[PDB]
Symmetry: D2
Subunit: 206 residues, 4 copies
């Protein structure tokens, strides 16, 4: 399923990200802000069980507990992802982290580095983060690795994704929960997202 989070709050931040006038401090900071907000969206979709707690005045009342918050494995795709993940962790403190290294349309992408914790089959909720999904190659390559682990669920957290990508990804993995703030219409020749926001990695790491 596709989850486009276009509420005023996120669209407001996205705007500042897109604005070529926002410096690296504010750019990185907004990536963090969206990561936490984005993690709160993902939070509401997770499996939870009904519990009972007694209150100070000695009365019992039903409550909620998002159990799966203990079963999260965030996958950091090297670079631009670091800041976004820094937001996600605000919503998934108990999550373990994996990092991946890969690099280059349609051209195949190769994985050159990868240290991922052990994904508990049928239990874990893997969250693969990367601010931008253009052609969707990077993402799909990481996916191969992830599906092998047979996780309970797989989420993809991005800021902007091209239509080409969303469809590319959801067409081969309809069971994947793809979250994003905006879906931009095109990819020029260089494989860039338009309007997009330029190069996230560069705008944040500086």
């Amino acid at each position: 399923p596709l989850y486009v989070i276009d509420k005023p709050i996120t669209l407001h931040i996205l705007t500042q990200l897109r604005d070529k006038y926002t410096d690296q401090i504010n750019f990185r900071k907004n990536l963090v802000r969206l990561g936490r907000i984005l993690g709160y969206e993902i939070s509401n979709t997770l499996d939870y069980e009904i519990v009972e707690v007694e209150t100070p005045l000695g009365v019992k009342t039903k409550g909620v507990d998002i159990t799966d918050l203990n079963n999260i494995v965030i996958i950091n795709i090297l670079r631009a992802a670091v800041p976004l993940v820094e937001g996600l962790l605000k919503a998934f403190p108990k999550a373990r982290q994996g990092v991946i290294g890969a690099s280059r349309k349609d051209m195949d992408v190769y994985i050159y580095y990868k240290k991922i914790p052990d994904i508990r089959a049928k239990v874990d909720n893997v969250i693969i983060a990367d601010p931008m999904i253009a052609t969707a190659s990077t993402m799909l390559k990481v996916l191969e690795e992830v599906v092998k682990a047979n996780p309970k669920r797989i989420y993809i957290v991005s800021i902007i994704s091209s239509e080409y990508g969303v469809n590319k990804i959801l067409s081969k993995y309809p069971f994947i929960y793809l979250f994003t703030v905006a879906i931009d219409p095109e990819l020029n020749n260089k494989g860039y997202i338009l309007p997009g926001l330029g190069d996230a990695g560069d705008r944040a790491f500086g």
Copy 2:
């Protein structure tokens, strides 16, 4: 209008708050967490205009600018509200802050107090701009609304563009008691507990947020 924010995330934190076993650190911390989350919600209700920015790649594109984020006066109802306001400020760093030291009078009686001797022992509110500012009144719990209504009497006078109320728990009695006397108010809350008890406390409730968070 009434805004009950009962998404799994907030209901999850509320549970923690209600849990008598939840210690002081965690109690105070969840009040902050909800304040932040509630500010974000309140943020999506604010007036915004569409602007048009230019991306590094040279093109223009429509965006969003919540202009009213520059126009926010938060009212921190002294004590319990401090952790909650800390939360809100994460969503409204351009907000001015008024502090009101209200204090309720205890009354052990037969029924449930309708209104109580609520006198304000403190009140330093910054200048509110008529027909422009969005005043946000914060207080973790609204029981009989005594306190709340008492403050609204002060804020109203300054005719703000609109008034919000941010609470974690609110009794049915109160919600109605406020939306009746001030119908065009934006009341946000995570849960609406059925009834108030013999001593004006909310049931089930989460205990005395004031004591729980400051000790």
Copy 3:
């Protein structure tokens, strides 16, 4: 004893606070920043016992545990103090907070408007009284007059700037107190403001 924290880092932030060009966001934010920084300074002065812990290679070694971090009772001198206490809480999360509103009415003394201080454990709690500006030290002394009655294990005072008049009037009446501050300004006018200071902290912070 007097603890003047004038390291480059704090003097750097103070400068921004003093600067008339620093807005409500940045002013309030630096009060928070200094609050946690001074909190760490107070931390280094607290009681702590030596403990033993086993490291991941099954090797036991000595370490440190500032348990007194469990016995903190911070007091808000209403308004300007809130942002300051916010940062201190970053260093004393387990602290119980106290709120207290006062006001004036040459060195005109004071009257207590509001006062809610949690129960202080005699010879156990480390009470920390927060208030960014200590001018004629009256507000401060009036609050002390109550805290001292509770015989806490210790008493700290956390401020950003304080006048020499104040530092001396406070440390002369209660010598055992730990007064922390970033700067000690020279004078104060006929009105009672600290010069050059930074203006009305409460107004610069709250707007």
Copy 4:
């Protein structure tokens, strides 16, 4: 020069880090806490300039401005450092983040490792303005300093104004192996553990910071 930051506050956090029973969250969180604390310590050694600002009181006063907070490049030695750098950034927001991915060529019981082979699987480092930038290399642990020296190998031909090393724990062997070759480096650390074992692990140490933090 060597800067051992062993004040009660940092020794208190280190203890928690060493405590094998310190769960992942708390472990990661303390790495952040120390990163920020250690940064404020570094800020205190940076070149500063006296300035003059204006109080609203119309009056004027001399002040401090560590102008060098604009000339900082942090190199996040990959994995272990993420939490550590995450806090240094709390002290150096105007810093550019360089990122090197180092991986040690393990070895098993033999004798005690004197220097190990390092495999570079990633490198994105901004341009270091010669005679201008203060480069800060971060890595929780320094065992044989193999990794460290490997990185210094590049950060040095760039002649930065100054080079800092931020670590939580470093072995005697390492501190000496680094400062003997790069006498003028500013090496910051909370503790200097005595010996290393046959696998090159610090003792007593605190385990594998990367494994503890990334789980």
